[PDB]
Amino acid sequence: GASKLRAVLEKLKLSRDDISTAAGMVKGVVDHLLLRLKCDSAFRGVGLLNTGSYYEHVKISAPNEFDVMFKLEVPRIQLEEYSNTRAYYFVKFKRNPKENPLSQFLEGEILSASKMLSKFRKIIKEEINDIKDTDVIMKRKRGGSPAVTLLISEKISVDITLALESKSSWPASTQEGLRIQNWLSAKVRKQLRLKPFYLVPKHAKEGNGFQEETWRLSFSHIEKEILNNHGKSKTCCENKEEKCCRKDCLKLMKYLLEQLKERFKDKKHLDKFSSYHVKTAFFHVCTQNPQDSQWDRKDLGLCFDNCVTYFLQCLRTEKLENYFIPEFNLFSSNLIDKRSKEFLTKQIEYERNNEFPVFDE
Ligand SMILES: CCCc1cc(=O)n2nc(NCc3cc(-c4ccncc4)ccc3Cl)nc2[nH]1
Ligand SMILES: [Zn+2]
């Protein structure tokens, strides 16, 4: 229970404090790459997404695996939804009397993620080789991923993702999403929806089996802003008497899935689940339990159980709405077959019934 879950959280804290030297190395490589990329005519306006914060850790049990997002603003973007999939869009340009450098990535009237990533990757590979103050290598592209992956010092890996930034209003598919009014208030929802949105290249293994040049909506800056300002109280987690366990529960949900994917990495059944699914379910639980008193630190075990049982319910009913785009069902059988969700249900039920053996040291 709570005492065991606390021990888990404490062990993961230890490894995070150690990797600050690794973060220093990552930041040094990323800053060199941005300086070089900004010299290119097509990537002139590239920059860090979450400029203050280099890097996230997608995988909490892999402290030496870093994730960084670059953003590239494209003004006057014209988006064309793909086959009413709600999440995937062709990117087109508006009126064309002025041509600009990004047109070198056009395929017809459509902005090609392939072409853009090819030049992106080529510049990084060149510049990585021209670095000599630290040993960094570029890893070969895996069949699906659009990310550029660097390996630093034999054990630090960095996934770099290039996102397009649009400063216009969010696409209409988001209009009924981000249902935070009863938790964080309607005016915070309005404020958040005034920020830009992002488009990222999709995986090859992602989508309808074609290699169409569609882009996927991305709201990772919104996820980050909410987690850093997450209470109903404006002073949640800013004093002794207002320490909640929201972030802890999310960490534990991520770690649960990571451990189970590892325990079963021989089989194929868990390959389609990722932190994305656990994060989505967590945010729904925050919507469902908006009071800070529902997240008291003393109740860590009960709050974590709440997150687990909600996730189990989503698996069993095969319904998990995207937090921003409610019509997109992460758990549709078009995306994950029923037997895979049934298998994960079985494993999470086993863990819950046995006080989570997959956690203990
Ligand atoms: C705060 C809740 C978690 C969250 C963070 C975030 O950054 N985003 N970004 C979107 N964009 C919409 C979208 C994304 C994907 C997707 C497919 C594959 N790998 C990732 C994402 C599939 C369908 C849809 Cl509709 N959703 C989210 N949720
Ligand atoms: Zn808090």
Swiss-Prot record:
Explain what the record says happens when changing D305A: Reduced interaction with the SPSB3 component of the ECS(SPSB3) complex
The outcome of changing N50D is: More than 75% inhibition of interferon beta production
Residues bearing (Microbial infection) Deamidated glutamine are Q291, Q294
Q: What induces it?
A: By type I interferons.
Motif KRKR-loop is found at 139-142
Q: Topology relative to the membrane, per the entry?
A: Peripheral membrane protein
Outcome (variant: K254Q) = Acetylation-mimetic mutant; reduced enzyme activity
Residues bound to 2',3'-cGAMP:
D67, D159, K202, R216
Q: What is the effect of changing K167E?
A: Abolishes stimulation of interferon production. Does not affect interaction with nucleosomes
Quote the annotated effect of R193E.
Abolishes stimulation of interferon production
PolyADP-ribosyl aspartic acid occurs at: D31
| UniProt cross-link Glycyl lysine isopeptide (Lys-Gly) (interchain with G-Cter in ubiquitin), position | K13, K125, K187, K224, K251, K254, K267, K268, K319
Q: Which residues carry this modification: 5-glutamyl polyglutamate?
A: E126
Motif residue range(s): KKH-loop: 267-269
Record site: Cleavage: D159, I160
UniProt motif Nuclear localization signal: location:
135-145
Looking at the UniProt record, the site noted as Important for preferential detection of curved long DNA sits at K27, L35
Query: What results from changing K13E?
Result: Strongly reduces stimulation of interferon production
User: Which catalytic reaction applies to this protein?
Assistant: GTP + ATP = 2',3'-cGAMP + 2 diphosphate; GTP + ATP = pppGp(2'-5')A + diphosphate; pppGp(2'-5')A = 2',3'-cGAMP + diphosphate
Q: What is its EC number?
A: 2.7.7.86
Which residues does this entry assign to the site Arginine-anchor? R95
Please describe the quaternary structure of this protein.
Answer: Monomer in the absence of DNA. Homodimer in presence of dsDNA: forms a 2:2 dimer with two enzymes binding to two DNA molecules. Interacts with nucleosomes; interaction is mainly mediated via histones H2A and H2B and inactivates the nucleotidyltransferase activity by blocking DNA-binding and subsequent activation. Interacts with PQBP1 (via WW domain). Interacts with TRIM14; this interaction recruits USP14, leading to deubiquitinate and stabilize CGAS and promote type I interferon production. Interacts with ZCCHC3; promoting sensing of dsDNA by CGAS. (Microbial infection) Interacts with herpes virus 8/HHV-8 protein ORF52; this interaction inhibits cGAS enzymatic activity by preventing the formation of liquid-like droplets by CGAS.
* Record remark: domains: Lys-27 and Leu-35 residues are specific to human and destabilize the interactions with short DNA, shifting the specificity toward the detection of curved long DNAs. Lys-27 and Leu-35 also restrain cGAMP production and, therefore, immune activation, allowing a more fine-tuned response to pathogens. The N-terminal disordered part (1-160) binds unspecifically dsDNA and expands the binding and moving range of CGAS on dsDNA. The disordered and positively charged residues enhance CGAS-DNA phase separation by increasing the valencies of DNA-binding. The N-terminus is required to sense chromatin and its phosphorylation blocks its activation by chromatin DNA. When the N-terminal part (1-160) is missing the protein bound to dsDNA homodimerizes.
Q: What else is known?
A: The cGAS-STING signaling pathway drives sterile inflammation leading to type I interferon immunopathology in severe COVID-19 disease caused by SARS-CoV-2 virus infection. Tissue damages in the lung and skin lesions are caused by activation of the cGAS-STING signaling leading to aberrant inflammation. Endothelial cell damage is also caused by activation of the cGAS-STING pathway: SARS-CoV-2 infection triggers mitochondrial DNA release into the cytosol.
Mind telling me what this protein is named? Cyclic GMP-AMP synthase
**Taxonomic lineage from the root:** Eukaryota, Metazoa, Chordata, Craniata, Vertebrata
Quick one: which gene encodes this?
CGAS
Whole sequence portion shown: 161 to 521 of 522
